[PDB]
A = this chain, B = another copy of it.
Amino acid sequence: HEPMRIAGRLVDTDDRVEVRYPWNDTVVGTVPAGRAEHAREAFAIAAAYQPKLTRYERQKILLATAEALAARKEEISDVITLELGISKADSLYEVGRAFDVFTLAGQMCIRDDGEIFSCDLTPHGKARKIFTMREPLTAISAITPFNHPLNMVAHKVAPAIATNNCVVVKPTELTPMTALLLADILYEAGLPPEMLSVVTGWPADIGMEMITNPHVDLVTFTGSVPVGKLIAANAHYKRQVLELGGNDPLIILNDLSDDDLARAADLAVAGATKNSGQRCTAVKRILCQESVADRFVPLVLERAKRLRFGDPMDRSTDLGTVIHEKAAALFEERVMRAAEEGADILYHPGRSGALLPPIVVDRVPHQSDLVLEETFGPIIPIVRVPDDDDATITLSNSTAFGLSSGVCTNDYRRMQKYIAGLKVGTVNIWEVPGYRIEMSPFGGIKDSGNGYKEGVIEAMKSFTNVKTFSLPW
């Protein structure tokens, strides 16, 4: 039972949004069905407040938050698992990521990336210097998805704090409780309350206000392509940082030894199945060159069978549920359909509500919905691709997405060919597409994002205006 947090105040409403635990579809919490007026108030407070925190004070708040996350991780991951349905293993891991986000944002506070230009450069030159500096925006709108109820909020809120911005968060109504808890932690860690609000409600009531409120200088959104494209249409003349899906490959080249195939298999399974496969950067396509497929697939199969799927609150569970039963149903459907198109299902112990096992499918036609569309579940789909890198690259690039990628090979020449040729934001050699540090530049192209980078450092830049000034010299 959680009210909204509007600049530190608990704000309630009559109507409720029920939050259900996807494992057994029971109500585990309720939050307000907030309305435009609530967001509107949150933004007015945000706009009127001018943060004056020193970099030291910002760092203290961010580092205090990091410890609170560590200290309370069991509690916080319980909340995550209860609304999202991912295993405690995955949700404990999420708290670790959020711990990194706050720690790195805290540490980046001592950093000033100002520049200096000399002006006596051309025939038009002058004896003068130009200096750079950053300033915060009026207010920032953050809209977050169900997949990382904690880490997604952390990524949007920590850089805002670090830069003396005021942010208003609207988490998805599917997983709003983690956000509300994070706000409480932040207020306790000493954040001036005006710097953060978390509002909840139905998209038809409060969603549009997040996009159109006149005080909002920047909308930062992570979510689906259709909602993303909608936002891009409706947030006129506001800066927008849009992080949409991925359809990311793990590419297995034919130079690999059997030992290496086994490591690549480890990556494939982990990358496909972590967070119940609910990552923009999950392995959604395992592109295996024909030559090595017969050796590779059995290794994948063997690993997929070891995974324990079931009760997410059980600490020995590897793989919990996906967000809900109809997502699970849709994913299994895409599997069945691939099979009818010629795919070979190797492992499928059966779906149970929102609980999908780590289904292994081989010889997936790469046109088939399963892999052409983004499939946001723990499917392990192997697409057999030619023993030709140009063909492999063209195939890898043939979807509407372009976020991240993983390539397993020991041949440098081929490595750099893929690095140069994949149309994506990130190419990871010998790691899953999902691999990054919380502060490296993160973002996709094509349908994966509108082309701006995120991660702690780029978010901090993104959340400021550069002001220049020049002095006689």
Contacts and interface: CB of A to CB of B under 8 A. Distances in A.
A440 interface: yes
A122 B108 CA distance: 14
A100 B124 contact: yes
Contact of A467 (B426, B431, B469): B426
A147 interface: no
Interface string A129-150: 0101000000000000000000
Interface in A115-134: 117, 119, 121-126, 128, 130, 132
B126 A470 contact: no
A104 interface: yes
A466 B437 contact: no
A218 B452 CA distance: 12
A204 interface: no
Contacts of A236: 229, 232-233
Interface in A232-275: 232-233, 236-239, 242
Interface in A411-441: 415, 419, 424-431, 435-441
B130 A429 contact: no
Nearest to A406: B470
B427 A467 contact: yes
Given A117-B437, A441-B132, A468 B124 contact: no
Contact of A450 (B97, B228, B237, B437): B237
Interface residues of A, number: 59
Interface string A201-222: 0000000000000000110000
A97 B126 contact: no
Nearest to A240: B237
B471 A429 contact: yes
Interface string A442-464: 01010000111100000000000
A107 to B, nearest CB: 9
A349 interface: no
Contacts of A415: 471
A472 B471 CA distance: 46
A343 to B, nearest CB: 31
B440 A130 contact: yes
A121 B237 contact: no
Contacts of A100: 122-124
B437 A467 contact: no
Contact of A130 (B128, B229, B437, B469): B437
Interface of A: 96-97, 99-100, 103-104, 117, 119, 121-126, 128, 130, 132, 217-218, 228-229, 232-233, 236-239, 242, 415, 419, 424-431, 435-441, 443, 445, 450-453, 465-472
13 contacts: A96-B123, A119-B437, A126-B435, A128-B431, A232-B237, A237-B450, A419-B467, A424-B467, A427-B470, A428-B469, A429-B471, A430-B471, A453-B466
Which 7 pairs show the lowest CB-CB distances between chains A and B?
Answer: A232-B237, A427-B469, A419-B469, A233-B236, A426-B468, A100-B122, A232-B236
